[PDB]
């Protein structure tokens, strides 16, 4: 797939600094949806503000995990059924911590945001469509983790 190459190429400069980029994604996420901030609790404590999440080793370690899973999707872009069961398993962990299916879109918007900003003029409408398609495939795989 030429479009798989668009994904792989677009991901290259992100993957070399996954924490800085994932930090953009999550900063965006809490700027769009501050109500997601309490879902991330460590020591039991609640982040008061979005910048508090950024000073937390556990939360930064969470970011790198997410960025690893997106990397795994990229690695497997040309089939993706090779990750299906992992992603479904990831989905039921999300159900169990109380995330809604409806939150998926804001995380995807946060990811696309982060890519557009990183790539600038290199984030062609073809690149964007390819990412939306990839993120959608990952979300449908995860959604089964609700039953599906
Ligand atoms: C529906 C929007 C989402 C919300 C609100 C959400 C929220 C969360 C929360 C609250 C956790 C647990 C945090 C913790 O206790 O440390 C988590 C874990 C995780 N998330 Fe998400 N998430 C969403 C979508 C996604 C997507 C699309 C991906 C990747 C494609 C993803 C990747 C991960 C990974 C890899 C973990 C670690 C799971 C584990 O430790 O077993 N999340 N997410």
Residue numbers in the entry: 3 to 150
Pull text from the paper:
Neuroglobin (Ngb) is a member of the globin protein family that is expressed in the brain (∼1 µM) and the retina (∼100 µM) of vertebrates. It is involved in the protection of the nervous tissue from ischemic damage via a still-elusive biochemical mechanism. Notably, Ngb is also a hexacoordinate protein in the ‘deoxy’ ferrous form, with the rate-limiting step for ligand binding being the spontaneous breakage of the distal His(E7)64–heme bond.
Crystal structures of NgbCO in the ‘dark’ state (no illumination) at 40 K and of Ngb*CO obtained under continuous illumination (‘light’ state) at 15 K were determined. Upon refinement of the ‘dark’ state NgbCO, the occupancy of heme-bound CO is estimated to be about 90%. The partial CO occupancy is owing to the intrinsic instability of CO-bound Ngb crystals, which tend to dissolve upon full ligation. We therefore avoided prolonged CO soaking, with the drawback of not achieving full ligation. In this work, we only utilized crystals with at least 90% CO ligation, as assessed by its occupancy in the determined structures [Fig. 3(a)]. The presence of photolysed CO in the protein matrix, which was not visible in the Ngb*CO structure, was inferred by the full recovery of bound CO in the ‘dark’ structures collected after illumination.
